[PDB]
């Protein structure tokens with residue numbers, strides 16, 4: 001996990017597309033080791049969005065050098081259908097996926113738990129869901145999240161799984177905190193970009 005840290009933000013806060021996609025491409029495979037096929041569709045959504053942005057990038061790497069480039073070029077390229085189109089739309093959903101991972105991990109690292117059920121991660125996943133995803137989900141997808149939530153492993157097993165290995169829980173969390181530095185900064189920059197370009201949409205699914 002700290003074998004594939006995201007690069008720090010450069011001074012101009014512009015995120016290079018290629019290295020960003022390479023970096024986040026290492027996240028989806030962590031879903032295979034949560035212990036349930038319930039996560040298979042979840043992995044597909046994130047992967048699918050990464051693939052969709054990569055494919056737009058591959059048509060003109062120079063034109064789409066940065067993520068900013070993607071949003072502004074597609075704004076010009078598409079007119080009225082933007083921002084509900086192309087790599088812009090893919091990245092709008094990707095960022096929420098990544099933000100969910102961010103809030104989930106930070107909650108774990110911050111020692112947030114249910115005093116009553118302390119070896120579960122339901123409260124952490126629930127907060128992540130509320131902050132990142134829930135307001136863009138209709139009632140049906142929300143009830144599906146609630147069902148999917150029980151496929152969550154214990155905190156102990158999830159952390160041991162991320163050590164895929166000879167290492168204490170405290171060591172593992174410190175590596176995760178390290179990862180979260182440039183991850184969070186990068187995700188924040190992307191959310192800021194959607195706000196400044198007025199590319200953020202609020203429709204539910």
Ligand SMILES: CCCCCCCC
Nearest residue numbers: 021022025047050051
């Ligand atoms: C460099 C990005 C490659 C696309 C990977 C798709 C999702 C894992």
